[PDB]
Amino acid sequence: ACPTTAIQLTPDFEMGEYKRQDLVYEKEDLLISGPGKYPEYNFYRMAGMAIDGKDKGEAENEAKPIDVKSLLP
Amino acid sequence: EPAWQTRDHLDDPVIGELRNRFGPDAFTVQATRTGVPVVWIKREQLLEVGDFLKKLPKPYVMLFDLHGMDERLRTHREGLPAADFSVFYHLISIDRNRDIMLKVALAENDLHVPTFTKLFPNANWYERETWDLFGITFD
Amino acid sequence: ATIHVDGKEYEVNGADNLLEACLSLGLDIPYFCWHPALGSVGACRQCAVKQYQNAEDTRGRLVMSCMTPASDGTFISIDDEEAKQFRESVVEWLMTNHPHDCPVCEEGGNCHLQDMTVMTGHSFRRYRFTKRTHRNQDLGPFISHEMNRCIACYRCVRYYKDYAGGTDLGVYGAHDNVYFGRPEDGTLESEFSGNLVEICPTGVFTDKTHSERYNRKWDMQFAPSIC
Amino acid sequence: PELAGIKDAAPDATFRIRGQKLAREPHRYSGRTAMRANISVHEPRQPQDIDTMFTFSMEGNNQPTAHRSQVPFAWAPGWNSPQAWNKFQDEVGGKLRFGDPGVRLFETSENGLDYFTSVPARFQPQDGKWRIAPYYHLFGSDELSQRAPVFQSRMPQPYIKLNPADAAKLGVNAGTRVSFSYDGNTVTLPVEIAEGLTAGQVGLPMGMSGIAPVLAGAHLEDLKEA
Amino acid sequence: MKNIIRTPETHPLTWRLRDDKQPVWLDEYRSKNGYEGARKALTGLSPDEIVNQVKDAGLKGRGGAGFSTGLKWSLMPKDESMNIRYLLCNADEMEPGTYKDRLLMEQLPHLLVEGMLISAFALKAYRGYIFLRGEYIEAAVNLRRAIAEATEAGLLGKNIMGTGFDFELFVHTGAGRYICGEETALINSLEGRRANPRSKPPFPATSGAWGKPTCVNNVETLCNVPAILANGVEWYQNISKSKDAGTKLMGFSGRVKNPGLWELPFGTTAREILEDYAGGMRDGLKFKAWQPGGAGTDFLTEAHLDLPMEFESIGKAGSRLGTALAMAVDHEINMVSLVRNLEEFFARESCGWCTPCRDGLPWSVKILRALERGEGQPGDIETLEQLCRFLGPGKTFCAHAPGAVEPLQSAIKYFREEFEAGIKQPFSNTHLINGIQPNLLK
Amino acid sequence: AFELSAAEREAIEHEMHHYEDPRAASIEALKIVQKQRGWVPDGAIHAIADVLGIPASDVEGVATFYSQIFRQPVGRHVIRYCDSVVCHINGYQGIQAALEKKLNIKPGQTTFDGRFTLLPTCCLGNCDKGPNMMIDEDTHAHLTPEAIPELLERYK
Ligand SMILES: NC(=O)C1=CN([C@@H]2O[C@H](COP(=O)(O)OP(=O)(O)OC[C@H]3O[C@@H](n4cnc5c(N)ncnc54)[C@H](O)[C@@H]3O)[C@@H](O)[C@H]2O)C=CC1
Ligand SMILES: Cc1cc2nc3c(=O)[nH]c(=O)nc-3n(C[C@H](O)[C@H](O)[C@H](O)COP(=O)(O)O)c2cc1C
Ligand code: SF4
Ligand code: SF4
Ligand code: SF4
Ligand code: FES
Ligand code: FES
């Protein structure tokens, strides 16, 4: 159900802890330092929102914004 | 015609047999996507309807299922009797290679159904489960 | 007055609209530009049904439910082939240039465009060309502006001008580079600009106060209260 | 006795539609077993609402075709927008189905009051005194609204309005500070010119910090430039 | 015929037109039987009598739809408390291939002034607005000079010829949009709004400009009526043996030997106009297609060139007459590029009101660009056909989109092979994610 | 810091006299400002809204709706070549390539001298006279690619 391929299920199964309270994995226990089973995908290259390093009209299959005041008909 | 179409199954000869036996009235045929003919039988006719189904030339010999349903929150009930609860009996005839469904409507004040274990002895655990999970009592 | 929907008789008002008569009966007709408190226009063409002349008629004619009176003796059809595929084409046209940013959008499970895209049953895409974009505006501390999400059903400008009497919002531009907003950057000085969050069926006008500390609609624990 | 109608707005806590309560949250309420997991992995019992007709979980009822007047939220299958309210009404754009919340509690009297003979005189401006006129900004004249952190950028700066003739008499130009004394406290506020105001009056935004709403209709002294 | 002879009996419009392409001013207009119809209307005829006279004379509207103007003038309200009626002249024409009003506005302005006078007295309208375009500028100067000369010579003002009827005329030069020619959008633009059209059956005849009863009529429509009230009624019905009464400014345009504009009676075949008045094709062109009306109607082949240029005769040919200004396309020009230019004009010149035109004409533009560049994918011609079927009358808010997609319909129906030849590369809408198995279907 | 001149304000009021509403005179007021100053600046919208009474959003919508109301600074002369179909058959692409070669600009752009602004036009309404192009209220017909530098060099 992830439309960004952010949450993934690794082939690692070596879990099991002493306390149940420590089984609640926070954000620092989940975010890994690389792209996993879907390496090359990036959701923000499809989204049309203004992004640090991505102006309006810079996403895939997306045109540059024509100004509302533009001279062309 | 697609296999998922909402069919009424009035072309089933068991419906014609029921119309010949108990009259064209006294039961309501429901058009569902279950693939089986579903008939709403009144409570006092249930034992004799089951007895008639058990004495057909190719009778309905196995009680496939028997369970209740809470109709109190069901908003989309068109072509259905006024029911607070319902009890459905799913019966299978192997010689006909067909199956029928028998729905009995119930009100809140009288959740009493005549027992079905005198006809199908596997109904004991199904009626116990209906009395456990629902409030339906079997006489 | 009585009407016939899908060969079924219904007793509706004769002095009201056909779209609101059908929606009052629990029937589902998609709509974008119509609001119960703003009247009816033709800014979209989403409420299309097929109207006949008499009881025995096959061809019909595609009319708008929000622009046809619900007079006595009308014979309309909602879920025939032609009206359904035309409404699918209209949501396809509206979603032809729509940004692929639903999970990062403020509407999410509150969006009317999502419900009317699912309701028309349009999932596959055959539009392979480029989309359309617009620059955003700073509308103040309460209204976040994301103009790319717009489908140009004119409900915001109609509410803000005709209903609310405000002098800030408006329509600019032309055929396809149409714009809905202020002539400059600034705060919407009308006292009813917050209703644009739910008046807009898309994520253009959204709640900035809910943009900060945001959750989806299904995650909200609601209660009926008094302001 | 005159408040006897408040047991008609909503039914008792022992009110159920087909035996069940009404849900405060939707059926797709996510993350129930990890919501409180940062402080206790053991999921606590749900809060018990004995006061009212509502349950704090999703195990309730929010059906549009349910015999009730008060709806927590509008949701219908296929209608996830705020346009799901039309499923909760008998006719759309009209009254809500099965009535409306809240009863009127007031009945019109058979006979009216008398003609109030007390007609006030004209407002004559007086030297050395100023009549305070309320302005009542929407975003700044409510006690619970100013404490909201998002309103603080929306309220205007604390100001005071003066007539052009009054400002010419005081010799103060618009935008500069003026000092006025009330309850023995000389406070300085920036002035602005009000064209529609009248002579002998001064204008204040009520409800703000330091400016009470009861200051309307009161007098003011010592309008001196700071 | 090789030489054209124009007489007032057979050419009611441009018999007084000057050969040196110079404007006919007031003295030359009244010398060549000027303001006789206005005199008869304002002296000896009741306004209802004039309305019924135009109704039985069969002056159908020359805007392009062919609605009878007697019906339009008869649907004005009968209430005497509504005395703020308006008359509007749709002088804005921005349809490609249509230039019929430029001639009558540049070198015959007093004919339009007299027609507006007669129509305003027939409708009891106290104000008239010539809604012009920003590109007709010499026409604007000529119209303003004609208005000044008329209001100097006792016309067009107050107490006209001692009748007591007050009428005054303005020229409203538009700021430039193709949608402004539609009568409801003309009303919205005249009110200085964005020129989005309005919805019928609240008609301009009952509630138009500023809520008052108005009517909008073309320049040709208002220019035929002085001939009706100056020459006669049965004369107007007896100039052509067809049920489309009157004369129309016909003419071919586009790479012909003599492109121009000639007044001809209805029922004249398009082959006659092309091979006689237009001179036919030049040396090397084969005349592979034509449109009856410029750019709004749909293409016809050589077999439809023999039909008379009438509303109903071209109606049964899967087409319509339109402005009756024929548009000729030769064999050397690709139909894909021509329909691409048509769709580009209709996409960029439409208004921004309703969904299907707004978001289907640019899609047609992009599909036709792909067909131009040879980047066509399988499923584009069927998309264009579905687009044409879903942009017909009634499906959109106004009639811009059906007139836009009629050339597409005729290009698909007749010249299909070039559209098939525009498709070369296979369908690819989605690209790989490299971690997800694609849903490849058969 | 936009300020309407006396002649502009008198023209706007005189056009206001001709209609039942100043809103009807909004479009002609925008045309007067465009004629006087070449284009409509940002403060002119508020100036028209102040002299009329209608909101500035309506004035901005009117200014951005119609094609020949320029909201960007244009050159001293606006070249307007016909983009329509009859001029496509007669050939407008040759004269467009000639204009692009002579001016070294694209349509929608202006030259670095601030002299010419190249734009397409919906339709000139002179289709029977070959290719068509309008410069500064002057139409030109029967155009050829070789006649473009001669026709361009007689303007200021
Ligand atoms: N430059 C030009 O001359 C152009 C002409 N056209 C033509 O415009 C036509 C489409 O124009 P529309 O106004 O949308 O079509 P239409 O046929 O609905 O209306 C044309 C006229 O008929 C009148 N009318 C029709 N039915 C009426 C009724 N029941 N009651 C009162 N009045 C009634 C309208 O008021 C209007 O004046 C097309 O035939 C097209 O050829 C289109 C584009 C450009
Ligand atoms: C999109 C559109 C554009 C139109 N443009 C013009 C036009 O430029 N000139 C014109 O006379 N009629 C135009 N019309 C037709 C008008 O709606 C109307 O029929 C005409 O102005 C007057 O009708 P008449 O023929 O009875 O005089 C247009 C219609 C539409 C739908
Ligand atoms: S901004 Fe929203 S309300 Fe306004 S036209 Fe666009 S989709 Fe409709
Ligand atoms: S407004 Fe657009 S981007 Fe946002 S949820 Fe709706 S469809 Fe998706
Ligand atoms: S069809 Fe619709 S969008 Fe197109 S010009 Fe007409 S009203 Fe405008
Ligand atoms: S809801 Fe009827 S056309 Fe928009
Ligand atoms: S097509 Fe160019 S002038 Fe009309």
| DSSP codes of every residue in C141-154 | SSEEE-GGG-----
Min Cα distance A55 → chain C (Å) is 10
CA C76–ligand 5 middle distance (angstroms): 25
Instruction: Please enumerate in sequence order all residues whose Cβ is within 8 A of that of F77, keeping only pairs 6 or more positions apart, or say none.
Output: F115, F116, F117, F135, F136, F155, F156
In chain E, ranges of CATH 3.10.20.600 domains: 247-329
CB atoms within 10 A of CB F86: 31
The residue whose CA has the least distance to atom 3 of ligand 4 is C102
Q: In chain D, what residues touch C140 (CB-CB under 8 Å)?
A: 154
Q: In the numeric block, which tokens belong to residue D48?
A: 């018990």
Strands laid side by side in the E127-132 sheet: E168-173, E127-132, E86-90, E214-218
Residues 6 or more apart whose CB falls under 8 angstroms from that of A68 comprise C134, C172, C173, C177, C179, F64
- In short, whether C155's Cβ falls inside 6 Å of ligand 3 is yes
**Can you read off the two tokens belonging to residue E65?**
């739809």
Apex CA E192: angle with CA E187 and CA E198, to 5°? 35
Between CA A64 and CA A50 the distance in angstroms is 13
- Report which of E250, E357, E231, E246 is spatially closest to residue E294, judged by C-alpha positions: E250
> Do residues D58 and D20 lie in contact, with contact meaning Cβ atoms separated by under 8 Å?
no
The CATH number of whichever domain residue B32 belongs to comes to: 3.30.460.80
DSSP E376-414: B-TTSHHHHHHHHHTTSTTTSSSTHHHHHHHHHHHHHHT
Is the Cβ atom of E380 under 6 angstroms away from ligand 1? no
Alpha-carbon Rg for chain E, nearest whole angstrom, is: 24
In Å, what is the CA distance from D91 to each residue of C6, C42, C69, E141?
Answer: 20, 22, 16, 58
Q: What's the Rg (C-alpha) of chain F?
A: 18
Q: Alpha carbon A26 to chain centroid distance?
A: 18
Q: Is the dihedral of CA D153, D154, D158, D161 positive or negative?
A: positive
| Nearest partner of E281 among E251, E250, E255, E252, judged by Cα | E255
Identity at D139, one-letter amino acid code:
F
Within 8 A by CB and 6+ apart from E70, the residues are E51, E52, E54, E55, E56, E57, E58, E59
Distance CA E320, CA E406 (A): 10
What residues contact C71, with CB distance under 8 A and at least 6 apart? C1, C14
User: Could you tell me if residue B4 is inside a domain?
Assistant: no
CA-CA distance, E225 to E70, in Å (whole number)? 11
- The tokens describing D177, both together, are 């500070």
Question: How far is it, in rounded angstroms, from Cα C159 to Cα D179?
Answer: 44
The ligand that comes nearest to the alpha carbon of residue E90 is 2
Alpha carbon distance C183, F42 (integer Å): 9
**Helix residue spans in E213-354 (DSSP H):** 219-231, 234-237, 270-272, 311-315, 335-349
Q: Which amino acid is at E153?
A: A
Q: How near does any CA of chain A get to the CA of F130, in Å?
A: 22
Instruction: Read off the CATH number of the domain in which D188 is found.
Output: 2.40.40.20
Secondary structure, 3-state, chain D = CCCHHHHCCCCCCCCCECCECEECCCCCCCCCCCCCCCCCCCCCCCCCCCCCCEECCCCCCCCCCCCCCCCCCCCECCECCHHHHHHHECCCCCCECCCCCCCCCCCCCCCCCCCCCCCCCCCCCCCCCEEEEECCCCCCCCHHHHCCCCCCCCCCCCCEEECHHHHHHHCCCCCCEEEEEECCEEEEEEEEECCCCCCCEEEECCCCCCCCHHHCCCEEEEEEEC
Q: Which two tokens mark D134? A: 């309320």
Contact by Cβ (8 Å): E412, E385: yes
Domain limits, CATH 3.40.50.11540, in chain E: 26-231
Cβ contact E225:E232 at 8 Å = no
Architecture of domain E335-422: Up-down Bundle (1.20)
Pairing status of strand D54-55 against strand D22-23: parallel
Distance separating alpha carbons of residues C18 and C4, to the nearest angstrom: 11
CB C50 within 8 A of CB C40: no
Task: Answer whether F57 touches C (CB < 8 Å).
Answer: yes
Choose which residue among C22, C27, C32, C91 to substitute to test ligand 6 binding: the one with the highest number of ligand atoms within 8 A of its C-beta: C32
In chain E, the largest separation of any two C-alpha atoms, in whole Å, equals 89
E317 contacts: CB under 8 Å, gap ≥ 6: E300, E304, E307
Question: How many distinct structural domains can be found in chain B?
Answer: 1
Q: Of C9, C32, C33, give the one whose Cα is nearest residue C21.
A: C9
Q: Is the shortest distance between the CB of E218 and ligand 2 below 6 Å?
A: yes
Domain span including residue D157:
129-225
Question: Encoding tokens for residue E368?
Answer: 């036709």
Tokens 């206790």 correspond to what residue? D40
Burial of D147 by CB count in 10 Å (0-12 exposed, 13-18 middle, 19+ buried)? exposed
Separation between Cα atoms, residue E89 and residue E117, nearest integer Å: 11
The closest ligand to the CA of C103 turns out to be 4
DSSP F75-103: -SEEEEEE-SSHHHHH-SHHHHHHHHHHH
CB spacing of F83 vs E135 below 8 angstroms = no
Half-sphere exposure (Cβ direction) of F46: Cα atoms closer than 13 Å = 9
Task: Give, for F7, the enclosing helix (H) or strand (E).
Answer: helix F6-17
Gyration radius of chain A over CA positions: 20
d(C-alpha C136, C-alpha C203), whole Å = 12
DSSP designation for C157: H
Q: Which residues of A touch E (CB under 8 A)?
A: 5, 37-41, 72-73
CB E197 within 8 A of CB E158: no
Q: Classify A13 as helix, strand or coil.
A: coil
Chain E within 8 Å of F12 (Cβ-Cβ)?
no
Contact flag C20-D153 (C-beta cutoff 8 Å): no
B7 is a domain residue = no
Written as six digits, the tokens of F71 are: 């909201």
Length, in residues, of chain A: 73
In a domain, B6, yes or no: no
What is the C-alpha separation between E94 and E241, in angstroms, rounded?
A: 32
Contacting residues for C185 by C-beta, under 8 A, at least 6 apart: C137, C138
**Contact in structure between E405 and E387 (CB atoms under 8 Å):** yes
- Contact between residue E37 and residue E229 where contact means Cβ atoms under 8 Å apart: yes
User: What are B87's two structure tokens?
Assistant: 């009890």
E12 cis-preceded (ω within 30 degrees of 0)? no
Looking at residue F108, what DSSP letter applies? T
Judge: domain F77-153, CATH 3.40.30.10: yes
Q: Of E188, E212, E189, E210, nearest to E199 (Cα)? A: E188
E247-329: CATH architecture: Roll (3.10)
Q: Which two tokens stand for residue D113?
A: 């009051």
In a domain, B3, yes or no: no
Q: What are the strands of the beta sheet with E289-291, ordered from one edge?
A: E252-253, E326-329, E289-291
Query: For residue E323, which phi and psi values (nearest 5 degrees)?
Result: -85, 0
Bridge partners of F118, per DSSP, are F79
Q: Name chain B's partners: 3 or more CB pairs within 8 A.
A: D
Q: Does D65 reach chain B within 8 Å, measured CB to CB?
A: yes
Give, as one character, the DSSP assignment of residue E300: B
Helices C112-119/C81-94 angle, 10° precision = 140
Closest CA to E197 of E360, E396, E425, E40: E396
Class of residue E410 by CB neighbours under 10 A (exposed 0-12, middle 13-18, buried 19+): buried
Q: Is the CB of F84 under 6 A from ligand 7?
A: yes
Query: How many angstroms separate the CA atoms of C162 and E43, rounded?
Result: 46
Residue C159: Cβ-neighbour burial (10 angstroms; 0-12, 13-18, 19+): buried
Residue E16 and residue E19: Cα distance in Å, rounded?
A: 9
Separation between Cα atoms, residue E246 and residue E266, nearest integer Å: 7
User: How many helices and strands in chain C, by DSSP H and E?
Assistant: 6, 9
Beta bridge partners of D20: D17
Q: What is the DSSP letter of C62?
A: E
Q: Which among E253, E299, E297 is positioned nearest to E278, based on CA atoms?
A: E253
Query: Is residue C181 classed as helix, strand or coil in its secondary structure?
Result: strand
Instruction: Name the H helices within E262-354.
Output: 270-272, 311-315, 335-349
Cross-strand bridge partners of residue B138: B113
Q: Is the dihedral of CA E158, E159, E160, E165 positive or negative?
A: positive
Instruction: Return the closest-CA partner of residue F45 out of F2, F99, F88, F8.
Output: F2
CA E351 to ligand 5 centroid distance, Å: 5
**Burial class, B97, CB count within 10 angstroms (exposed 0-12 / middle 13-18 / buried 19+):** exposed
With residues binned 3-state (H G I as helix, E B as strand, rest as coil), the percentages for chain B, rounded to 5, are 25, 30, 45
Check contact E-D (3+ Cβ pairs < 8 Å): no
Is the CB of D150 less than 8 angstroms away from the CB of C209?
yes
Task: Give the single-character DSSP code of C35.
Answer: B
Distance in angstroms (rounded) separating the CA atoms of residues B137 and C200:
53
Under a CB-based contact definition with an 8 Å cutoff, are residues E39 and E14 in contact? Answer: no
Residue position matching structure tokens 């359904």: C84
Look at residue B111 and tell me if it is in a domain.
yes
Given a contact cutoff of 8 angstroms between Cβ atoms, the answer to whether E218 and E101 are in contact is yes
Return the amino acid letter for D173. Answer: N
Flag whether residue B75 sits within 8 Å of chain D, measured between CB atoms.
yes
Residues 6+ apart with CB under 8 A from F146: F98
Residue E130's nearest CA partner among E167, E166, E163 is E167
What is the pairing mode between strands D219-225 and D177-182?
Answer: antiparallel
If you measure from the C-alpha of residue D219 to the centroid of ligand 7, how many angstroms do you get, rounded to a whole number?
75
Quick one: tokens of D119? 């007609």
CATH class of E26-231: alpha beta
For chain A, what percentages of helix, strand and coil (3-state, to nearest 5) are there?
10, 5, 85
Q: How far apart are CA D82 and CA D71, in angstroms?
A: 13
Range of the domain at B25: 13-139
Q: Which experimental method was this entry solved with?
A: cryo-EM
